[PDB]
Amino acid sequence: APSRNGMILKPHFHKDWQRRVATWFNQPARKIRRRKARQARARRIAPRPAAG
Amino acid sequence: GVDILHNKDRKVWRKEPKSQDMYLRLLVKLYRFLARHTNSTFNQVVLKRLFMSRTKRPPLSLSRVIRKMKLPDRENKTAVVVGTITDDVRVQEVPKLKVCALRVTSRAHSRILKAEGKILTFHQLALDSPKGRGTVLLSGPRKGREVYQHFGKAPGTPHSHTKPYVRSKGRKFERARGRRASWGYKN
Amino acid sequence: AKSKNHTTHNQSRKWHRNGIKKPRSQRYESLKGVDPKFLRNMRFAKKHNKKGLKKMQANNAKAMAARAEAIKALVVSRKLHRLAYIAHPKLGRRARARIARGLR
Amino acid sequence: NFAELKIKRLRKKFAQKMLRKARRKLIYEKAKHYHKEYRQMYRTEIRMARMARKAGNFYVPAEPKLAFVIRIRGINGVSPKVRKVLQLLRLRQIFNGTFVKLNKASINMLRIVEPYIAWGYPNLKSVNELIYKRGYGKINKKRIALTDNTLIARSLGKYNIICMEDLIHEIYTVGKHFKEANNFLWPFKLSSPRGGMKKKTTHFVEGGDAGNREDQINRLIRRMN
Amino acid sequence: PALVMSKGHRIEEVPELPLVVEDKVEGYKKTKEAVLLLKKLKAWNDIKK
Amino acid sequence: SAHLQWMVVRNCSSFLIKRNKQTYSTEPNNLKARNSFRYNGLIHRKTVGVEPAADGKGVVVVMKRRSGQRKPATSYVRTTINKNARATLSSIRHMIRKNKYHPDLRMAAIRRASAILRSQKPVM
Amino acid sequence: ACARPLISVYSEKGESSGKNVTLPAVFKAPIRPD
Amino acid sequence: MHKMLNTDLSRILKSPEIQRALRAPRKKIHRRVLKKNPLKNLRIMLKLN
Amino acid sequence: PSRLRKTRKLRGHVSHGHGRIGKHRKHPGGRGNAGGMHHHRINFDKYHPGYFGKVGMRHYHLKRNQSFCPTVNLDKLWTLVSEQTRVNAAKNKTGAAPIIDVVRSGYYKVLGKGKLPKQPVIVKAKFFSRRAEEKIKGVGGACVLVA
RNA sequence: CGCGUCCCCCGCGAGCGCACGGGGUCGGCGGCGAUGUCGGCUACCCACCCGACCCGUCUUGAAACACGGACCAAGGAGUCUAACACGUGCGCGAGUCGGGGGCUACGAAAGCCGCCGUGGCGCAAUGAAGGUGAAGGCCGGCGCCGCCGGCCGAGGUGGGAUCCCGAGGCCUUCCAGUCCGCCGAGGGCGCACCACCGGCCCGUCUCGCCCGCCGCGCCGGGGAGGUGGAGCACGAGCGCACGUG
RNA sequence: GAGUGGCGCGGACGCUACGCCGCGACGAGUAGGAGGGCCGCUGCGGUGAGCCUUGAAGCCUAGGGCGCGGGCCCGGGUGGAG
């Protein structure tokens, strides 16, 4: 029940949304993985440009 | 057994700023001393205004401090704001400006000083004028904040130009039944 | 399961807690709800007030000289009084000074 | 040099001593003037009544200018109009007292609270005891006791009430500055009547204490002061 | 140095300064060189703490 | 400045010591030894410190100089006074009053030095 | 003030070198515990 | 930027710029003073009347 | 910070600040925007007028690229071109107007809100207001259209 | 209770001392003091006197013949996430923010990039939409014209905290007399803000007329007066944190 | 206020300014709200040159007390590592 003067909003949380929560603790470890996979690429293509 | 209503006994002014920042708290100590030991009412207002919340000391823009200092009998006078002085980009001409403010935005500094203007602080304003003799005390707009457009009479109640709280404005976000004679009705 | 239908019992007690406030007594009433034939004309009366300003600064400043021809041309007992005269530091300054010296 | 500044600081200290003594003699001679007034006031009232009875005619003395209104009933179960009038008379607490001058506008306020007050026309000595013992001043919205002459003079000096005797004069003889003198006094915090009330609930006419007591408020002022 | 003592760091025999050392302290490769540094600059009583 | 680094030190200094509805300051130059703007011996240009001597008897007077105040070693100059109970108290009254050196601490220092002299004075 | 004094540099022996640095304006920036 | 440039208000509040245009210190503390009855006390009556 | 919250002052108090008569029940007015026309009609009328009902034409595949037309005023138009131009074009006697390309700065229309300072300009904008033209012409300049 | 003076009838004495005088002192006293007494309010047990029904709960009303509770330990109930509103604190401020990305033990941290500021919200509103999209008076050329000019210029009113000017005034057997310091008759400049009047922009309706023109018409703009808008009228937002809902 | 004319080397307390102090008036209270906790529990960054096998935590107490209260500090016993 709405109290007083306050914004009308429709929260999209009516599904089983808690099962499908994607938490970003992968993020700081992902940037290490993506960087080591980018340097070791560039070290293979030794005189070639690294962007390609 | 005295019939006094204790509803309106505790006054809701401020006795100190809620901010724990020391520089602003060292300034209060300097104007607590002046508010009481000077006959001036300038130092009463400046002390009272140092206590006030961010919303109560709004940013007075450069163009008002141009406008409200071009007035007659205001020449060779120092403009005092207890809020801040923000740079107004759509004003070209910038005179000499003796200005005291807690903060000035670095682009307004860049503007004021280059036009041979001097910027003081409230510690220097006391040394320049303890009683505040020859000072223009200003404030920015306090119905400035967009928050005030939602206040007053109810949006959905006749002769109210009140901004309603809508998720997003388009052609189908609160437009039909309360707003048109064609729909249910118009207020 | 019947209930109490209506009352106005505690209502007078509630109305005077913030006071039965008389409405916002302000100068300059709005021109809201004024007959829009009259309001057209009054809006035109303000529209052309500039038209008779050279008549105005002349006439209102000839009446300024009329103030310079009219104002330039214009021009319980006794015993307590002598104490009340002496006993305050504006009118009894020299009077106390002659009491003080009068012990010689 | 300081040969001047020692001697200059003494002269200003002397100037303020003789400024006190000049004010002090005025406060005496104003009080001695009042002792003549109260004699002449008291005696002319009896004088007029004798030259009436000599002729055989009646001297109706002036309806009293001044009342002393004491609240007698409690703070619980009081009508809203009756609350308002009691707190315009500054009777907010049981056995509070204030001086109320009589006119048409004030007797109609004193008849609308007749159960909840014990009022009447106070004596010159009844005014004395209330202003000396129970006399407190409303200085800076603070109930500061009238202990020195330079409290009434500080507040009421512009109406030439410069001592306690001037205030007693202003109260008893309801002058042109009665409002500024009565409102200066804090409502008198009187004790419970020493000996006992007759009957709080009913009017004085029906063997009670509630309402008018013409000379009989003086019997109860000394009972309470 | 009032706030550094009020922090609690033993700074009493620091000879002078917001302390700045010569650039041959970057060139160290052993702790015995580094301990004998803090003895001379008299900040060793802060590690003894 | 003195007033600035008080508004930091006043509540959250390491020397600060709060218990039993009491507040003190365990600073090496606080005398009366309470958390105060007057007696704090880190903050000011001028700092009178009074301590018991490194020897058995006598009182040292710790004088803070004018020049090196960012210089924690060359700052404090110490002088030990191993004299009678009168002309140890007198030396301190002469060091403060007749040098204009922090005359707020003129009497607070002499009550201390006296109580140090009273301590290193044997029991019967 | 905005006065930036002449901060010395110390050799590893604990004695002051003849090479001196002007105290950077960072060290006079407002002391804010807040 | 600094909100206040000179924070040594030891120096400010006793500098002769401010010290001219103050009012005088009212350091005389006034405690509560007892009432005395005119009936009971004569030389409290003689102070008033 | 849980310690600063209200729940920490309601330990001991029975109801936990949610009424003793009307108990803290789960959903006593329906879940969310329930009864918007029925038992919450007044809330949805008093503060959200126009909420219920249709209005105007549906536009199915609407992209926010075709309707892209961001506006600069004549008020802040001299911010887009540097301070070095404005002083030089004022100082110089030749009467050569500096070109203000509005498409470069990110805007596609120039509206005429502000008071433009009295030196000739050239505005290479895509769209123009009528008042925006009059001010540029009034000071004495060109309104160059661009594609 | 002076004399040296200014009329109508007949400017500081020199001390003492006592005190009903801005809240108590005595410059008065006397007893008992080591395994038998001294104090210790509190805390153990006990007795007397007066008071005193059992808590929690819903309730108009509970000691209730309302319900839960034999007793004790431990466990046990407004959380976290997203969104929104408002208040408050911080930073920068017509901006602001890297939050995604990239660069270089604690460290999965921190530091940095600005042609990584895309983008978010803000800076512009309004209309269903096509769209449009936020000041002007006068003074000269052509008692008047569209228009060639022309300096000037974001209103007006009333109330407004503060500031400004100052007629005059604030003293030492004295008279001019400068300089500061301060108060006040009276006067103005008036911040914020409020009420009112104007104006301005979009929608729509009535009125009426002029203009533009590579494309002259089922074209394009303009004007006056009402009226609808979550607008303008010399920006306040954005980010972060906390509180409450 | 200030110009210019007519012997003795002496004087208590203070003011964590978030402090200290003075004067007046007032103090019911369910639902409910807000504030202040040098109230209490558990972890964290600091910090106390902290405390501890010459006995930590805990637990008991006719011990001494403190705070309006939440609670806390000591004495005695017990215990064995924080």
Short mmCIF file of N, CA and C (backbone and C1' of nucleotides) in Angstrom, two decimals, chain J residues 133-177:
data_model
loop_
_atom_site.label_atom_id
_atom_site.label_comp_id
_atom_site.label_asym_id
_atom_site.label_seq_id
_atom_site.Cartn_x
_atom_site.Cartn_y
_atom_site.Cartn_z
P G J 133 11.38 27.62 -33.63
"O5'" G J 133 11.45 27.39 -32.05
"C5'" G J 133 10.60 28.13 -31.16
"C4'" G J 133 10.77 27.66 -29.73
"C3'" G J 133 12.16 27.81 -29.13
"O3'" G J 133 12.29 29.09 -28.53
"C1'" G J 133 11.36 25.62 -28.72
P A J 134 13.25 30.20 -29.17
"O5'" A J 134 13.35 31.29 -28.01
"C5'" A J 134 13.77 30.92 -26.69
"C4'" A J 134 12.86 31.52 -25.65
"C3'" A J 134 13.56 32.34 -24.58
"O3'" A J 134 13.55 33.70 -24.98
"C1'" A J 134 12.06 30.76 -23.59
P A J 135 14.57 34.75 -24.35
"O5'" A J 135 13.62 35.96 -23.93
"C5'" A J 135 13.34 37.04 -24.83
"C4'" A J 135 12.48 38.06 -24.14
"C3'" A J 135 11.98 39.22 -24.99
"O3'" A J 135 10.88 38.86 -25.82
"C1'" A J 135 12.70 40.01 -22.87
P G J 136 10.62 39.63 -27.20
"O5'" G J 136 10.16 41.09 -26.72
"C5'" G J 136 10.83 42.30 -27.15
"C4'" G J 136 10.94 43.25 -25.98
"C3'" G J 136 10.49 44.68 -26.20
"O3'" G J 136 9.08 44.87 -26.14
"C1'" G J 136 12.58 44.70 -25.12
P G J 137 8.39 46.12 -26.89
"O5'" G J 137 8.95 47.38 -26.09
"C5'" G J 137 8.59 48.72 -26.47
"C4'" G J 137 9.00 49.71 -25.40
"C3'" G J 137 9.16 51.16 -25.85
"O3'" G J 137 7.95 51.92 -25.71
"C1'" G J 137 11.14 50.45 -24.79
P C J 138 7.21 52.52 -27.01
"O5'" C J 138 8.22 53.64 -27.53
"C5'" C J 138 8.21 55.00 -27.04
"C4'" C J 138 9.63 55.49 -26.80
"C3'" C J 138 10.24 56.38 -27.88
"O3'" C J 138 9.88 57.75 -27.69
"C1'" C J 138 11.77 54.67 -27.30
P C J 139 9.58 58.71 -28.95
"O5'" C J 139 11.02 59.03 -29.53
"C5'" C J 139 12.00 59.77 -28.77
"C4'" C J 139 13.37 59.68 -29.43
"C3'" C J 139 13.45 60.12 -30.88
"O3'" C J 139 13.57 61.53 -31.00
"C1'" C J 139 14.55 58.04 -30.62
P G J 140 13.00 62.28 -32.30
"O5'" G J 140 13.77 61.55 -33.49
"C5'" G J 140 13.31 61.65 -34.85
"C4'" G J 140 14.46 61.46 -35.81
"C3'" G J 140 14.09 61.17 -37.25
"O3'" G J 140 13.75 62.34 -38.01
"C1'" G J 140 15.63 59.56 -36.54
P G J 141 12.61 62.26 -39.13
"O5'" G J 141 13.25 61.30 -40.23
"C5'" G J 141 13.92 61.84 -41.39
"C4'" G J 141 14.83 60.81 -42.03
"C3'" G J 141 14.33 60.18 -43.32
"O3'" G J 141 14.69 60.98 -44.44
"C1'" G J 141 15.07 58.48 -41.84
P C J 142 13.74 61.03 -45.73
"O5'" C J 142 13.37 59.50 -45.97
"C5'" C J 142 12.29 59.13 -46.86
"C4'" C J 142 11.91 57.68 -46.66
"C3'" C J 142 10.56 57.28 -47.22
"O3'" C J 142 10.65 56.99 -48.62
"C1'" C J 142 10.87 56.34 -45.05
P G J 143 2.28 65.16 -31.55
"O5'" G J 143 1.71 64.87 -33.01
"C5'" G J 143 2.35 63.94 -33.90
"C4'" G J 143 1.31 63.26 -34.77
"C3'" G J 143 1.86 62.39 -35.89
"O3'" G J 143 2.06 61.06 -35.43
"C1'" G J 143 0.30 63.92 -36.78
P C J 144 3.52 60.38 -35.44
"O5'" C J 144 3.26 58.99 -36.18
"C5'" C J 144 2.15 58.15 -35.82
"C4'" C J 144 1.76 57.28 -36.99
"C3'" C J 144 2.82 56.29 -37.47
"O3'" C J 144 2.84 55.16 -36.60
"C1'" C J 144 1.71 57.30 -39.33
P C J 145 4.14 54.22 -36.55
"O5'" C J 145 3.97 53.30 -37.84
"C5'" C J 145 5.02 53.21 -38.82
"C4'" C J 145 4.66 52.20 -39.89
"C3'" C J 145 5.83 51.72 -40.75
"O3'" C J 145 6.59 50.63 -40.23
"C1'" C J 145 4.06 52.44 -42.15
P G J 146 6.05 49.70 -39.03
"O5'" G J 146 7.02 48.44 -39.12
"C5'" G J 146 6.49 47.10 -39.18
"C4'" G J 146 6.58 46.55 -40.59
"C3'" G J 146 7.98 46.22 -41.09
"O3'" G J 146 8.40 44.94 -40.63
"C1'" G J 146 6.75 47.34 -42.78
P C J 147 9.77 44.80 -39.82
"O5'" C J 147 10.78 45.70 -40.66
"C5'" C J 147 11.40 45.22 -41.87
"C4'" C J 147 11.86 46.39 -42.71
"C3'" C J 147 13.17 47.03 -42.27
"O3'" C J 147 14.30 46.44 -42.92
"C1'" C J 147 11.50 48.70 -42.54
P C J 148 15.76 46.66 -42.29
"O5'" C J 148 16.38 47.83 -43.19
"C5'" C J 148 17.81 48.01 -43.28
"C4'" C J 148 18.17 49.47 -43.51
"C3'" C J 148 18.92 50.15 -42.38
"O3'" C J 148 20.33 49.90 -42.44
"C1'" C J 148 17.14 51.53 -43.07
P G J 149 21.07 49.11 -41.25
"O5'" G J 149 20.08 49.28 -40.02
"C5'" G J 149 20.50 49.88 -38.78
"C4'" G J 149 20.47 51.39 -38.88
"C3'" G J 149 20.75 52.12 -37.57
"O3'" G J 149 22.15 52.27 -37.42
"C1'" G J 149 18.78 52.99 -38.56
P G J 150 22.97 51.36 -36.37
"O5'" G J 150 22.93 52.23 -35.04
"C5'" G J 150 23.16 53.65 -35.06
"C4'" G J 150 22.46 54.32 -33.91
"C3'" G J 150 22.24 53.50 -32.65
"O3'" G J 150 23.42 53.27 -31.89
"C1'" G J 150 20.29 54.72 -33.13
P C J 151 23.92 51.76 -31.62
"O5'" C J 151 24.55 51.85 -30.15
"C5'" C J 151 25.46 52.90 -29.78
"C4'" C J 151 24.84 53.80 -28.73
"C3'" C J 151 24.47 53.16 -27.41
"O3'" C J 151 25.58 52.98 -26.54
"C1'" C J 151 22.71 54.57 -28.14
P C J 152 25.71 51.63 -25.68
"O5'" C J 152 24.32 51.54 -24.92
"C5'" C J 152 24.08 52.28 -23.71
"C4'" C J 152 22.60 52.37 -23.40
"C3'" C J 152 21.98 51.20 -22.66
"O3'" C J 152 22.25 51.24 -21.25
"C1'" C J 152 20.55 51.86 -24.42
P G J 153 23.34 50.26 -20.58
"O5'" G J 153 22.46 49.42 -19.54
"C5'" G J 153 22.02 48.07 -19.81
"C4'" G J 153 20.52 48.04 -20.00
"C3'" G J 153 19.90 46.65 -20.06
"O3'" G J 153 19.53 46.17 -18.77
"C1'" G J 153 19.27 47.86 -21.98
P A J 154 18.71 44.80 -18.62
"O5'" A J 154 19.42 44.08 -17.39
"C5'" A J 154 19.35 42.65 -17.22
"C4'" A J 154 17.94 42.24 -16.85
"C3'" A J 154 17.84 41.00 -15.96
"O3'" A J 154 16.73 41.05 -15.07
"C1'" A J 154 16.84 40.56 -18.06
P G J 155 16.74 42.07 -13.82
"O5'" G J 155 15.76 43.22 -14.31
"C5'" G J 155 14.43 43.33 -13.79
"C4'" G J 155 13.57 44.17 -14.70
"C3'" G J 155 12.52 45.02 -13.99
"O3'" G J 155 13.07 46.30 -13.70
"C1'" G J 155 11.45 43.61 -15.54
P G J 156 13.16 46.82 -12.19
"O5'" G J 156 11.64 47.14 -11.84
"C5'" G J 156 10.89 48.07 -12.63
"C4'" G J 156 9.42 47.98 -12.30
"C3'" G J 156 9.05 48.05 -10.83
"O3'" G J 156 9.14 49.38 -10.33
"C1'" G J 156 7.80 46.34 -11.88
P U J 157 9.64 49.65 -8.83
"O5'" U J 157 8.42 49.14 -7.95
"C5'" U J 157 7.13 49.76 -8.06
"C4'" U J 157 6.07 48.94 -7.38
"C3'" U J 157 6.27 48.67 -5.90
"O3'" U J 157 5.96 49.84 -5.15
"C1'" U J 157 5.55 46.69 -6.96
P G J 158 6.93 50.33 -3.97
"O5'" G J 158 6.46 49.43 -2.74
"C5'" G J 158 5.10 49.46 -2.28
"C4'" G J 158 4.80 48.24 -1.45
"C3'" G J 158 5.83 47.87 -0.39
"O3'" G J 158 5.80 48.72 0.75
"C1'" G J 158 5.09 45.92 -1.51
P G J 159 7.12 48.92 1.63
"O5'" G J 159 7.30 47.50 2.32
"C5'" G J 159 6.39 47.08 3.35
"C4'" G J 159 6.62 45.63 3.73
"C3'" G J 159 7.99 45.31 4.31
"O3'" G J 159 8.10 45.73 5.66
"C1'" G J 159 7.37 43.64 2.75
P G J 160 9.54 46.05 6.27
"O5'" G J 160 10.31 44.67 6.08
"C5'" G J 160 11.74 44.59 6.24
"C4'" G J 160 12.25 43.25 5.76
"C3'" G J 160 13.73 43.22 5.41
"O3'" G J 160 14.54 43.01 6.55
"C1'" G J 160 12.51 42.29 3.63
P A J 161 15.41 44.20 7.16
"O5'" A J 161 16.27 43.46 8.27
"C5'" A J 161 15.68 42.44 9.10
"C4'" A J 161 16.57 41.23 9.17
"C3'" A J 161 18.05 41.50 9.39
"O3'" A J 161 18.28 41.79 10.77
"C1'" A J 161 17.79 39.88 7.69
P U J 162 19.23 43.00 11.17
"O5'" U J 162 20.65 42.50 10.64
"C5'" U J 162 21.58 43.41 10.03
"C4'" U J 162 22.41 42.69 9.00
"C3'" U J 162 23.47 43.56 8.34
"O3'" U J 162 24.63 43.57 9.17
"C1'" U J 162 22.19 42.51 6.66
P C J 163 25.44 44.92 9.41
"O5'" C J 163 26.24 45.07 8.04
"C5'" C J 163 26.91 46.29 7.71
"C4'" C J 163 26.87 46.53 6.22
"C3'" C J 163 26.83 47.99 5.80
"O3'" C J 163 28.15 48.52 5.86
"C1'" C J 163 25.16 46.82 4.63
P C J 164 28.48 49.80 6.77
"O5'" C J 164 28.23 51.02 5.78
"C5'" C J 164 28.74 51.00 4.43
"C4'" C J 164 27.93 51.91 3.54
"C3'" C J 164 27.66 53.30 4.08
"O3'" C J 164 28.80 54.13 3.87
"C1'" C J 164 25.66 52.39 3.22
P C J 165 29.44 54.98 5.08
"O5'" C J 165 28.67 56.37 4.97
"C5'" C J 165 28.73 57.16 3.76
"C4'" C J 165 27.49 58.01 3.62
"C3'" C J 165 27.22 59.00 4.73
"O3'" C J 165 28.03 60.16 4.61
"C1'" C J 165 25.20 57.92 4.09
P G J 166 28.75 60.78 5.90
"O5'" G J 166 27.53 61.23 6.81
"C5'" G J 166 26.62 62.26 6.38
"C4'" G J 166 25.55 62.50 7.42
"C3'" G J 166 26.06 62.99 8.77
"O3'" G J 166 25.33 64.12 9.23
"C1'" G J 166 24.76 61.00 9.04
P A J 167 26.11 65.41 9.79
"O5'" A J 167 25.08 66.60 9.54
"C5'" A J 167 23.82 66.42 8.86
"C4'" A J 167 22.68 66.96 9.69
"C3'" A J 167 23.03 67.58 11.04
"O3'" A J 167 23.62 68.87 10.91
"C1'" A J 167 21.10 66.23 11.25
P G J 168 24.81 69.31 11.90
"O5'" G J 168 24.05 69.58 13.27
"C5'" G J 168 24.62 69.21 14.55
"C4'" G J 168 23.70 68.24 15.25
"C3'" G J 168 24.11 67.86 16.67
"O3'" G J 168 23.61 68.84 17.57
"C1'" G J 168 23.55 65.91 15.43
P G J 169 24.17 68.95 19.08
"O5'" G J 169 25.42 67.97 19.10
"C5'" G J 169 25.90 67.40 20.34
"C4'" G J 169 25.41 65.98 20.49
"C3'" G J 169 26.19 65.12 21.48
"O3'" G J 169 25.62 65.27 22.79
"C1'" G J 169 25.92 63.96 19.42
P C J 170 26.56 65.39 24.08
"O5'" C J 170 27.05 63.89 24.32
"C5'" C J 170 28.03 63.58 25.33
"C4'" C J 170 28.46 62.13 25.23
"C3'" C J 170 29.89 61.84 25.63
"O3'" C J 170 29.99 61.68 27.05
"C1'" C J 170 29.40 60.77 23.57
P C J 171 31.39 61.34 27.75
"O5'" C J 171 32.41 62.34 27.05
"C5'" C J 171 33.75 62.53 27.56
"C4'" C J 171 34.06 64.00 27.73
"C3'" C J 171 35.09 64.33 28.80
"O3'" C J 171 35.99 65.37 28.39
"C1'" C J 171 33.04 65.40 29.32
P U J 172 37.50 65.43 28.95
"O5'" U J 172 37.37 66.34 30.25
"C5'" U J 172 38.43 66.40 31.23
"C4'" U J 172 38.15 67.47 32.26
"C3'" U J 172 39.00 67.40 33.52
"O3'" U J 172 39.34 68.70 33.99
"C1'" U J 172 36.73 67.20 34.11
P U J 173 38.11 70.07 38.11
"O5'" U J 173 39.24 71.19 38.23
"C5'" U J 173 39.53 72.08 37.13
"C4'" U J 173 38.70 73.34 37.23
"C3'" U J 173 37.97 73.76 35.97
"O3'" U J 173 36.73 73.06 35.81
"C1'" U J 173 39.14 75.62 36.81
P C J 174 36.31 72.48 34.37
"O5'" C J 174 36.08 73.80 33.51
"C5'" C J 174 35.83 73.74 32.09
"C4'" C J 174 36.22 75.04 31.44
"C3'" C J 174 36.19 75.05 29.92
"O3'" C J 174 34.88 75.35 29.44
"C1'" C J 174 38.24 75.98 30.69
P C J 175 34.41 74.88 27.97
"O5'" C J 175 35.13 75.93 27.01
"C5'" C J 175 34.68 77.30 26.91
"C4'" C J 175 35.46 78.05 25.86
"C3'" C J 175 35.51 77.42 24.47
"O3'" C J 175 34.32 77.66 23.73
"C1'" C J 175 37.69 78.06 25.09
P A J 176 33.80 76.60 22.63
"O5'" A J 176 34.30 77.25 21.26
"C5'" A J 176 34.81 76.46 20.17
"C4'" A J 176 36.00 77.16 19.54
"C3'" A J 176 36.70 76.41 18.42
"O3'" A J 176 36.10 76.57 17.14
"C1'" A J 176 38.31 77.14 19.98
P G J 177 35.63 75.29 16.28
"O5'" G J 177 36.96 74.43 16.11
"C5'" G J 177 38.16 74.97 15.50
"C4'" G J 177 39.38 74.15 15.88
"C3'" G J 177 39.31 72.65 15.61
"O3'" G J 177 39.73 72.34 14.28
"C1'" G J 177 40.03 73.01 17.84
#
